[PDB]
Amino acid sequence: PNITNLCPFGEVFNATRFASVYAWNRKRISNCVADYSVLYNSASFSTFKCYGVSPTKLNDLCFTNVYADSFVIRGDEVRQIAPGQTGKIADYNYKLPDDFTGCVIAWNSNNLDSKVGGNYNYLYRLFRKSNLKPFERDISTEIYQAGSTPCNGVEGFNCYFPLQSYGFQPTYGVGYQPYRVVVLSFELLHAPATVCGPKKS
Amino acid sequence: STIEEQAKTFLDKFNHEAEDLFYQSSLASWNYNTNITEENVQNMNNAGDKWSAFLKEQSTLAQMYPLQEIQNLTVKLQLQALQQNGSSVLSEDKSKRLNTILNTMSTIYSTGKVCNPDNPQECLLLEPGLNEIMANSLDYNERLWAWESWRSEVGKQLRPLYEEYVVLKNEMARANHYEDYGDYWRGDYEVNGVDGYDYSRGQLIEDVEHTFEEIKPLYEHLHAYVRAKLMNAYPSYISPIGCLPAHLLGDMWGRFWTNLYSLTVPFGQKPNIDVTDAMVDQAWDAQRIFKEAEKFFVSVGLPNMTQGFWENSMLTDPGNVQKAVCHPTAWDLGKGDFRILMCTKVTMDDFLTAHHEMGHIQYDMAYAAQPFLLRNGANEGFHEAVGEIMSLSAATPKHLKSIGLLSPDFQEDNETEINFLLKQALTIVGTLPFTYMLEKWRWMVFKGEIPKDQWMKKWWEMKREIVGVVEPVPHDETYCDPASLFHVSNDYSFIRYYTRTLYQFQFQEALCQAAKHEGPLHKCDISNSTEAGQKLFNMLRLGKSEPWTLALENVVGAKNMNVRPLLNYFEPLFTWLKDQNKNSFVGWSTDWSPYA
Ligand SMILES: *[C@@H]1O[C@H](CO)[C@@H](O)[C@H](O)[C@H]1NC(C)=O
Numbered sequence: 001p002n003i004t005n006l007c008p009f010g011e012v013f014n015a016t017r018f019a020s021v022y023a024w025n026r027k028r029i030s031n032c033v034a035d036y037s038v039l040y041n042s043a044s045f046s047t048f049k050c051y052g053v054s055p056t057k058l059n060d061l062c063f064t065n066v067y068a069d070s071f072v073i074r075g076d077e078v079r080q081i082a083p084g085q086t087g088k089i090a091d092y093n094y095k096l097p098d099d100f101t102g103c104v105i106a107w108n109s110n111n112l113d114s115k116v117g118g119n120y121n122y123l124y125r126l127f128r129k130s131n132l133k134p135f136e137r138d139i140s141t142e143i144y145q146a147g148s149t150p151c152n153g154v155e156g157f158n159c160y161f162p163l164q165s166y167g168f169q170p171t172y173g174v175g176y177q178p179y180r181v182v183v184l185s186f187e188l189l190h191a192p193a194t195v196c197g198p199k200k201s
Numbered sequence: 202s203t204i205e206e207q208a209k210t211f212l213d214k215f216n217h218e219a220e221d222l223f224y225q226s227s228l229a230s231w232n233y234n235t236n237i238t239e240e241n242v243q244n245m246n247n248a249g250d251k252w253s254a255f256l257k258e259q260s261t262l263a264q265m266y267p268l269q270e271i272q273n274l275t276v277k278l279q280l281q282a283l284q285q286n287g288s289s290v291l292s293e294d295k296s297k298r299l300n301t302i303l304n305t306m307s308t309i310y311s312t313g314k315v316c317n318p319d320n321p322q323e324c325l326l327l328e329p330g331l332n333e334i335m336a337n338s339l340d341y342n343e344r345l346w347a348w349e350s351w352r353s354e355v356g357k358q359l360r361p362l363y364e365e366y367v368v369l370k371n372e373m374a375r376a377n378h379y380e381d382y383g384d385y386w387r388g389d390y391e392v393n394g395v396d397g398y399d400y401s402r403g404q405l406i407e408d409v410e411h412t413f414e415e416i417k418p419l420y421e422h423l424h425a426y427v428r429a430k431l432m433n434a435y436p437s438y439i440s441p442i443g444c445l446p447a448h449l450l451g452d453m454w455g456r457f458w459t460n461l462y463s464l465t466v467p468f469g470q471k472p473n474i475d476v477t478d479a480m481v482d483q484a485w486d487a488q489r490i491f492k493e494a495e496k497f498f499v500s501v502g503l504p505n506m507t508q509g510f511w512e513n514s515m516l517t518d519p520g521n522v523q524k525a526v527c528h529p530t531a532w533d534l535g536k537g538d539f540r541i542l543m544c545t546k547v548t549m550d551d552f553l554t555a556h557h558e559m560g561h562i563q564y565d566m567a568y569a570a571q572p573f574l575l576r577n578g579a580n581e582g583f584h585e586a587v588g589e590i591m592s593l594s595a596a597t598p599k600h601l602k603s604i605g606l607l608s609p610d611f612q613e614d615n616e617t618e619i620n621f622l623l624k625q626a627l628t629i630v631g632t633l634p635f636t637y638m639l640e641k642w643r644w645m646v647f648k649g650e651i652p653k654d655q656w657m658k659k660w661w662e663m664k665r666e667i668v669g670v671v672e673p674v675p676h677d678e679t680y681c682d683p684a685s686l687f688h689v690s691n692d693y694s695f696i697r698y699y700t701r702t703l704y705q706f707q708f709q710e711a712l713c714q715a716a717k718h719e720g721p722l723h724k725c726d727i728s729n730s731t732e733a734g735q736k737l738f739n740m741l742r743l744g745k746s747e748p749w750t751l752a753l754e755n756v757v758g759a760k761n762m763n764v765r766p767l768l769n770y771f772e773p774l775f776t777w778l779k780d781q782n783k784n785s786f787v788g789w790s791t792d793w794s795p796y797a
Pocket residue numbers: 009010013014038
């Protein structure tokens with residue numbers, strides 16, 4: 001029949017501000033129609049790497065919920081948003097499971113997220129005692145203890161603040177320019193699947 | 202937990218915060234250089250002070266991690282680089298005195314203006330005009346006046362300052378567990394902890410003497426030929442048996458002999474390889490010059506320039522309203538930002554300079570993957586050598602014919618090769634005894650081998666013995682003749698040019714053997730060879746992570762600097778000079794036979 005009530009992809013992709021990678025935004029997408037051909041046929045995306053599913057059959061299959069995680073990382077750190085990777089982002093900021101079904105979409109955002117003075121509103125976690133579990137968010141701002149001595153809440157010697165700012169500038173290299181990353185996670189649960197593709201007439 | 206993990210986390214924090222502070226400082230320096238305005242000077246000074254204070258605070262924090270409990274070579278290298286006190290070990294009064302002395306020497310050298318007695322209404326500064334007088338005049342007493350007047354004013358101002366400078370730098374170096382300031386400078390080539398590839402500070406002087414002893418026959422023949430030609434130019438001043446007069450070498454100090462090419466040309470009647478007119482006829486813009494250089498670097502397999510390079514570099518003079526430094530400089534600003542600041546003209550020299558600076562940029566791009574404090578050359582010689590090899594390759598007639606700048610029917614006979622090799626010898630071979638003598642004199646001054654009352658008596662004795670250059674009139678100890686040069690007056694190491702010159706031809710032989718060139722070494726071009734680019738990039742990607750001996754093994758297969766590639770490069774010229782010196786006397790006498 002006639003289809004309306006599209007899924008809110010405008011409020012994820014075209015958001016005025018994105019979250020930091022340590023505090024990545026997760027939006028649960030339910031009970032709407034998800035048109036994936038609009039995203040795939042866009043020329044504005046640099047990375048559209050899908051793991052576990054192909055883009056052609058996205059517009060046909062149906063899923064119970066869609067998780068849209070949005071954050072900003074560097075150009076050289078886009079490769080770490082993948083199953084089985086190692087790095088600062090994978091270990092300490094955003095960890096993907098090995099058995100991940102979904103798509104990683106990234107695009108350059110030097111135009112919006114970089115200012116001439118330096119945009120320090122994007123943070124990343126530099127130190128954590130252990131690696132993150134998949135789909136875990138750590139927003140703690142407690143001082144990292146690298147040494148035997150207690151930090152006592154003050155950043156001195158062997159005790160560092162774990163969140164460090166990115167300093168985006170428009171004159172940076174392509175490996176240091178800000179990239180907005182949206183990761184879509186597709187899961188099927190025993191509940192009735194409601195995020196279905198558009199049906200042709 | 203462990204000391205090594207603590208040092209690794211500290212190095213991660215240092216790398217991340219240092220890279221951003223270094224970017225801000227470098228961008229301020231760039232904004233000053235492309236726009237000379239007082240607010241840009243203030244911003245540069247503020248950024249530099251923040252950067253220096255941050256380095257002091259991080260070095261102070263870094264020393265608290267002992268070196269002997271760390272086993273990873275890269276972590277130990279970064280900690281060794283960071284834990285150097287520098288001037289911080291010295292007292293605050295003496296540190297302030299040393300900084301004041303360095304600044305006032307910089308002002309005296311930069312703003313030194315000297316003109317002829319009895320005509321003082323206007324005067325000429327060295328950089329604007331004395332260079333042209335030294336490089337183009339053919340008058341004996343005029344060059345003598347310029348040379349003696351500049352060494353009189355500059356040396357008489359700088360002699361007490363240099364006497365304070367040597368004592369303060371020796372005090373800082375012995376406070377830093379070095380024998381002298383010369384040992385501190387030689388510590389750049391020090392490799393410790395690697396089995397077989399260890400290099401000592403004391404081995405550098407021995408290697409320099411061993412290489413120079415093999416340099417000496419070629420320089421003696423070149424000196425005899427230059428002496429005969431200068432005798433033709435100036436009939437009575439130059440003796441057949443003696444040294445060359447100091448003020449006749451084509452430059453202010455004798456650093457290069459490249460301004461004597463007109464006087465000492467073998468075959469003037471034969472044409473030159475000047476390609477300036479060909480670019481003028483085809484309307485080659487500076488953008489086209491850099492695109493051709495980029496085409497050269499992509500032909501060998503190296504990465505091409507970034508979009509930010511083309512957008513952010515200044516490759517043309519901005520105009521009258523905006524002031525900029527004219528000196529060509531490649532800037533590695535950090536964070537993948539690479540720029541070239543050159544006031545490019547349509548000349549061969551600017552085209553070769555474009556190749557040289559883009560070689561600097563390629564070297565900077567290659568070690569971008571390395572940690573911040575290891576983003577340098579393995580030694581001070583490699584960074585200049587990798588630009589000089591591109592300057593060597595681009596200047597070849599094969600490269601000019603390949604890119605269309607030279608006519609395909611240009612006749613490459615032996616005479617043009619001889620005069621081109623002589624020009625390259627005047628630029629390259631002639632600087633080697635001056636560089637070696639200057640560094641050996643500074644090392645003996647820092648070591649205390651030469652007392653302060655005997656500095657000049659030894660110095661001229663060294664110059665006659667090594668360089669074969671005699672003083673026009675004797676100088677007493679009120680003069681300070683070495684410090685009239687830019688590098689010595691402003692606290693710069695000078696052995697980098699000697700090491701650069703040997704590394705240049707070693708790299709050239711390695712890449713030409715890789716590229717399967719079948720002729721003379723000076724006729725070799727490294728374009729179109731992927732394997733040569735791969736052999737270069739293996740060393741280029743390392744940066745300062747590996748010892749310079751291991752990097753040299755990676756390129757040439759040798760663990761030490763070698764002199765045989767340079768001698769192989771100039772072998773046609775060496776045979777020609779031996780043929781031309783049959784009647785004349787090779788070698789010089791240290792006596793006062795020409796003039797004193
Ligand atoms: C986001 O912005 C682009 C650029 O204006 C636009 O073409 C696109 O339709 C917008 N929405 C989505 C869902 O991509």
